[PDB]
Amino acid sequence: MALLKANKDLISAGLKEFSVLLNQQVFNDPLVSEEDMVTVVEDWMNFYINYYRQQVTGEPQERDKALQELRQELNTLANPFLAKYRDFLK
């Protein structure tokens, strides 16, 4: 797996941020619909990616390769979240 120390070190920070942030969720009094929640997950990652991209380092392709993977992490991170909500409520 092609993952530099500094490159992977950046994604690791965001990876844990999503896990911890998700832990805050209680799932009991969610007023927001499942549809409106979808757009939130997308915008949520867009905000994080914009921050990290503003603090990268390496090479043109390296930074692009490291940031490109950030999507995979957040992409799947949604799998458990969506499965939980969909399983808990409609």
UniProtKB/Swiss-Prot annotation:
Keywords: Chaperone, Cytoplasm. One of its GO terms (biological process) is erythrocyte differentiation. GO terms for molecular function: hemoglobin binding; unfolded protein binding. It comes from Homo sapiens. GO terms for cellular component: cytoplasm; hemoglobin complex. Belongs to the AHSP family. Acts as a chaperone to prevent the harmful aggregation of alpha-hemoglobin during normal erythroid cell development. Specifically protects free alpha-hemoglobin from precipitation. It is predicted to modulate pathological states of alpha-hemoglobin excess such as beta-thalassemia. Expressed in blood and bone marrow. SUPFAM superfamilies: Alpha-hemoglobin stabilizing protein AHSP (SSF109751). Induction: By GATA1 during erythroid maturation. Gene3D superfamilies: AHSP (1.20.58.420). The lineage of its organism: Eukaryota, Metazoa, Chordata, Craniata, Vertebrata. Monomer. Forms a heterodimer with free alpha-hemoglobin. Does not bind beta-hemoglobin nor alpha(2)beta(2) hemoglobin A. Pfam families: AHSP. This is Alpha-hemoglobin-stabilizing protein. It is found in: Cytoplasm.
